[PDB]
Amino acid sequence: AMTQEIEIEFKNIVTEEEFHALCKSFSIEVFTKQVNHYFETPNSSLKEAGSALRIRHKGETYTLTLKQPAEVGLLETHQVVTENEAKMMMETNVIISGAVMNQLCKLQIPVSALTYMGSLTTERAETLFEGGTLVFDHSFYYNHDDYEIEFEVQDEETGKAAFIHLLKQHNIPIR
Amino acid sequence: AMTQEIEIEFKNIVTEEEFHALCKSFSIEVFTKQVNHYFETPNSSLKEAGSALRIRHKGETYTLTLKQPAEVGLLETHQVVTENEAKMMMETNVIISGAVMNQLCKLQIPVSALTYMGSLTTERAETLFEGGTLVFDHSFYYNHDDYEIEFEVQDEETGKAAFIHLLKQHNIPIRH
Numbered sequence: 001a002m003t004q005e006i007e008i009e010f011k012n013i014v015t016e017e018e019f020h021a022l023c024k025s026f027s028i029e030v031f032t033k034q035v036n037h038y039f040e041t042p043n044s045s046l047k048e049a050g051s052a053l054r055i056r057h058k059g060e061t062y063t064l065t066l067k068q069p070a071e072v073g074l075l076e077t078h079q080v081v082t083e084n085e086a087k088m089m090m091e092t093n094v095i096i097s098g099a100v101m102n103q104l105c106k107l108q109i110p111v112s113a114l115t116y117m118g119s120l121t122t123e124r125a126e127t128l129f130e131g132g133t134l135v136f137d138h139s140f141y142y143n144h145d146d147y148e149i150e151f152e153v154q155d156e157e158t159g160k161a162a163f164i165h166l167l168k169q170h171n172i173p174i175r
Numbered sequence: 176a177m178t179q180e181i182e183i184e185f186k187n188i189v190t191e192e193e194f195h196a197l198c199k200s201f202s203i204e205v206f207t208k209q210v211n212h213y214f215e216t217p218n219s220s221l222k223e224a225g226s227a228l229r230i231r232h233k234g235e236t237y238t239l240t241l242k243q244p245a246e247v248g249l250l251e252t253h254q255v256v257t258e259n260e261a262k263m264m265m266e267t268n269v270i271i272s273g274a275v276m277n278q279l280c281k282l283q284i285p286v287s288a289l290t291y292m293g294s295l296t297t298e299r300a301e302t303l304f305e306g307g308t309l310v311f312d313h314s315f316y317y318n319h320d321d322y323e324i325e326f327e328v329q330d331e332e333t334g335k336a337a338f339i340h341l342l343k344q345h346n347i348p349i350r351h
Contacts, residue, residue: 040320140213142211143227
């Protein structure tokens with residue numbers, strides 16, 4: 001149910017034209033839908049502490065996730081919950097107990113002030129690339145849609161070089 | 176239960192500090208929560224067509240609202256709907272019939288493709304000012320929260336000059 005991980009992930013915004021070209025370049029055909037239900041306090045506490053708190057619905061699975069700062073990249077705490085647990089967090093704004101609650105209290109978020117603020121649909125595809133994972137994200141936000149390429153790595157120094165090299169190969173500007 | 180209006184909107188991004196100062200100038204203390212549930216097709220048809228479709232939930236009310244191009248600004252169509260109707264649209268992706276559906280057909284949006292794509296919360300206060308409605312918004316998006324000032328008017332020329340003069344009066348730079 002419960003895992004934690006250190007995630008090192010570079011991200012670049014891209015245009016629609018660049019996105020479609022890069023997807024054809026990697027033979028990216030199939031996209032997987034996911035929806036993220038995000039939480040925050042009226043004072044933006046999560047954001048102020050470099051952190052994010054979300055319930056991801058992907059397939060039949062719901063996962064409560066906290067991302068927070070680590071020395072390198074982010075420390076992520078995932079907790080699989082049931083649909084009904086997901087819906088009660090969203091309708092009551094009370095966060096279920098367990099690893100994610102434990103980390104929020106140690107971060108000193110005023111947990112009782114957290115509220116369900118909204119949601120976003122992302123279409124996501126991935127592929128293994130230079131011993132990292134290349135991610136193609138198309139997200140539908142309130143008045144606009146956003147295209148991103150991401151790269152999750154094991155080595156921050158060599159991963160970065162590989163990512164910047166890829167962008168350069170494809171004449172994609174660093175954004 | 177249904178209205179249409181031609182609407183002209185000016186918007187400026189402000190800092191929290193600018194936002195609180197402008198609020199204090201207008202005796203704005205109370206904010207009202209509002210949630211917008213938005214729809215779009217996989218092809219982004221609505222965005223292509225300069226348009227937006229949302230269900231807004233505020234207070235007791237759900238309002239299905241379509242925004243589309245007018246010769247200047249936007250033609251808004253509003254249709255008040257029931258909780259059940261709102262939920263049905265969000266769960267099944269089917270747009271209820273009436274004035275908003277009729278406008279979507281005229282736009283040639285592939286209506287059967289529209290899907291419920293997400294939602295966002297906004298804390299809002301409005302005051303009547305010069306030719307219109309001055310809006311103070313604090314919105315909570317996925318990655319971040321923003322403060323924005325908007326001005327909704329019917330007269331473009333004078334509306335724009337008044338909004339610009341108000342921003343300079345308070346040393347707020349133009350950020351589109």
